[PDB]
Design an enzyme around this catalytic site. Structure first.
Site, PDB file in Angstrom:
ATOM      1  N   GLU A   3      38.529  40.987  34.531  1.00  0.00           N
ATOM      2  CA  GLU A   3      36.914  40.967  34.770  1.00  0.00           C
ATOM      3  C   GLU A   3      36.707  42.591  34.273  1.00  0.00           C
ATOM      4  OE1 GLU A   3      35.137  37.649  36.747  1.00  0.00           O
ATOM      5  OE2 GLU A   3      36.026  38.939  38.345  1.00  0.00           O
ATOM      6  N   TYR A  13      31.894  44.251  30.887  1.00  0.00           N
ATOM      7  CA  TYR A  13      31.168  43.594  29.823  1.00  0.00           C
ATOM      8  C   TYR A  13      31.302  41.905  30.144  1.00  0.00           C
ATOM      9  CZ  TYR A  13      29.109  47.827  27.944  1.00  0.00           C
ATOM     10  OH  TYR A  13      28.520  49.197  27.879  1.00  0.00           O
ATOM     11  N   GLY A  14      31.970  41.376  30.985  1.00  0.00           N
ATOM     12  CA  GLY A  14      32.087  40.132  31.270  1.00  0.00           C
ATOM     13  C   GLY A  14      33.382  39.595  31.458  1.00  0.00           C
ATOM     14  N   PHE A  38      45.941  39.062  21.747  1.00  0.00           N
ATOM     15  CA  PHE A  38      46.433  39.047  23.037  1.00  0.00           C
ATOM     16  C   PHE A  38      47.523  39.915  23.061  1.00  0.00           C
ATOM     17  CE2 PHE A  38      49.125  36.989  26.165  1.00  0.00           C
ATOM     18  CZ  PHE A  38      48.500  37.223  27.302  1.00  0.00           C
ATOM     19  N   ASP A  49      35.159  54.607  27.647  1.00  0.00           N
ATOM     20  CA  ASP A  49      35.515  53.986  29.137  1.00  0.00           C
ATOM     21  C   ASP A  49      37.140  54.015  29.013  1.00  0.00           C
ATOM     22  OD1 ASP A  49      35.288  53.429  31.557  1.00  0.00           O
ATOM     23  OD2 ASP A  49      34.604  51.482  31.158  1.00  0.00           O
ATOM     24  N   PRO A  84      43.656  53.203  32.338  1.00  0.00           N
ATOM     25  CA  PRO A  84      44.878  52.419  32.321  1.00  0.00           C
ATOM     26  C   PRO A  84      44.683  50.783  32.060  1.00  0.00           C
ATOM     27  CG  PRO A  84      45.478  54.067  33.993  1.00  0.00           C
ATOM     28  CD  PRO A  84      43.532  54.110  33.527  1.00  0.00           C
TER      29      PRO A  84
HETATM   30  C1  PDY Z   1      51.341  40.797  33.189  1.00  0.00           C
HETATM   31  C2  PDY Z   1      50.022  40.336  33.708  1.00  0.00           C
HETATM   32  O1  PDY Z   1      49.126  41.370  33.137  1.00  0.00           O
HETATM   33  C3  PDY Z   1      48.382  41.226  32.176  1.00  0.00           C
HETATM   34  C4  PDY Z   1      48.123  39.971  31.408  1.00  0.00           C
HETATM   35  C5  PDY Z   1      47.388  39.745  30.402  1.00  0.00           C
HETATM   36  C6  PDY Z   1      46.841  41.024  29.529  1.00  0.00           C
HETATM   37  N1  PDY Z   1      45.837  40.686  28.669  1.00  0.00           N
HETATM   38  C7  PDY Z   1      44.886  41.481  28.481  1.00  0.00           C
HETATM   39  C8  PDY Z   1      43.683  41.517  29.315  1.00  0.00           C
HETATM   40  C9  PDY Z   1      44.125  41.462  30.802  1.00  0.00           C
HETATM   41  C10 PDY Z   1      42.431  42.096  29.111  1.00  0.00           C
HETATM   42  N2  PDY Z   1      41.581  42.466  29.868  1.00  0.00           N
HETATM   43  C11 PDY Z   1      40.075  43.407  29.738  1.00  0.00           C
HETATM   44  C12 PDY Z   1      39.477  43.347  30.961  1.00  0.00           C
HETATM   45  C13 PDY Z   1      38.179  44.015  30.795  1.00  0.00           C
HETATM   46  C14 PDY Z   1      38.570  45.626  30.439  1.00  0.00           C
HETATM   47  N3  PDY Z   1      39.405  45.594  29.436  1.00  0.00           N
HETATM   48  C15 PDY Z   1      40.597  44.661  29.113  1.00  0.00           C
HETATM   49  N4  PDY Z   1      42.125  42.315  27.492  1.00  0.00           N
HETATM   50  C16 PDY Z   1      42.979  41.941  26.742  1.00  0.00           C
HETATM   51  C17 PDY Z   1      43.014  41.996  25.194  1.00  0.00           C
HETATM   52  C18 PDY Z   1      44.127  41.413  24.863  1.00  0.00           C
HETATM   53  N5  PDY Z   1      45.063  41.228  25.700  1.00  0.00           N
HETATM   54  N6  PDY Z   1      44.366  41.536  26.821  1.00  0.00           N
HETATM   55  C19 PDY Z   1      46.807  42.335  30.339  1.00  0.00           C
HETATM   56  C20 PDY Z   1      47.486  42.187  31.522  1.00  0.00           C
END
Ligand code: PDY
EC number: 2.7.11.22
Length: 283
Positions: free
Chosen positions: A12, A15-16, A76, A121, A124
């Site tokens: 979350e 931006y959404g 992903f 922005d 981590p």
């Molecule tokens: C081990 C479980 O944790 C995870 C599981 C999946 C992700 N994947 C992911 C996540 C969680 C994600 N979240 C966005 C949330 C808002 C800020 N920027 C990143 N964006 C992307 C783009 C491509 N993959 N991805 C990251 C962490």
């Protein structure tokens, strides 16, 4: 859009909401529903971002503007640096892997910056990692595109009210992340804008006209700011070596004009023995 099957909510952002989803191509993607028709400028900016392709930038696969809403389909990845840091807390990320990640993120920044595109922005949770040792920047260009959020990585010129800030803001954020990988603690964990600024001042010294010409004329600068002395980096990031401390000091220069560029940082002696280790990842 009916072309995708949600798998689960994965995040979350500002931006959404972000979902893991399957494209009914077979591909597994991260799908972002942009918080909201869509203003025409946001469209043309995001369309520009689709072209900005680099191995250390999370690929924007598709931009779906339908039903007067905006969906961004991203490559992903299975893990982020926040979660990896939390999992590595007992013994720390090994130095060679820290250095590999810093090096790759500076390559990503040097790419975007050479096209005049800023992240604004970095944090981590925006840095995504795979099993191959790669690290990638997520949500690049989105802040310009669209107009509790963490202040921990915010550059001092932003906090002082500068309206027209530069690529130097992303270097500051990355130096803050570098320090956090090394020490296993956030460098400046502020919980308000003044607490963020005053944490920076307590560690790096209250800036003045000597180290930052023009600082005292900044929009939110106040002559009544307390005047703190600067600390030694040997106290700030032990046990980082002198090449690392030297590089970090240049990434954390108060004056955005003196702060090191991504391209110059890639040439720093710290990177002389850089390698690409693979992390241990439990997915
Ligand atoms: C081990 C479980 O944790 C995870 C599981 C999946 C992700 N994947 C992911 C996540 C969680 C994600 N979240 C966005 C949330 C808002 C800020 N920027 C990143 N964006 C992307 C783009 C491509 N993959 N991805 C990251 C962490």
């Amino acid at each position: 859009m009916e072309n995708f099957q949600k798998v689960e909510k994965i995040g979350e952002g500002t931006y959404g909401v972000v979902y893991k989803a399957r494209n009914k191509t077979g591909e597994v993607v991260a799908l972002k529903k942009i918080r909201l028709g869509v203003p025409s400028t946001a469209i043309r900016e995001i369309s520009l971002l689709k072209e900005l392709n680099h191995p250390n930038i999370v690929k924007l696969l598709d931009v779906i503007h339908t039903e007067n809403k905006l969906y961004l389909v991203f490559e992903f990845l299975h893990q982020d640096l926040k979660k990896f840091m939390d999992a590595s807390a007992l013994t720390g990320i090994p130095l060679p892997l820290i250095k590999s990640y810093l090096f790759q993120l500076l390559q990503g920044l040097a790419f975007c910056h050479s096209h005049r595109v800023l992240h604004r922005d970095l944090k981590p949770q925006n840095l995504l990692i795979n099993t191959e040792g790669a690290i990638k920047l997520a949500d690049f260009g989105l802040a310009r595109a669209f107009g509790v959020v963490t202040l921990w990585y915010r550059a001092p010129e932003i906090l002082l009210g500068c309206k027209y800030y530069s690529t130097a803001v992303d270097i500051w954020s990355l130096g803050c992340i570098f320090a956090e990988m090394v020490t296993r603690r956030a460098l400046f964990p502020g919980d308000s804008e003044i607490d963020q600024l005053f944490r920076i001042f307590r560690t790096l010294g209250t800036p003045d006209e000597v180290v930052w010409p023009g600082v005292t004329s900044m929009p939110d600068y106040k002559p009544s700011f307390p005047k703190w002395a600067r600390q030694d980096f040997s106290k700030v990031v032990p046990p980082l070596d002198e090449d690392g401390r030297s590089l970090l000091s240049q990434m954390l220069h108060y004056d955005p004009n003196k702060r090191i560029s991504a391209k110059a940082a890639l040439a720093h002696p710290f990177f002389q023995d850089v390698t690409k280790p693979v992390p241990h990842l439990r997915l």
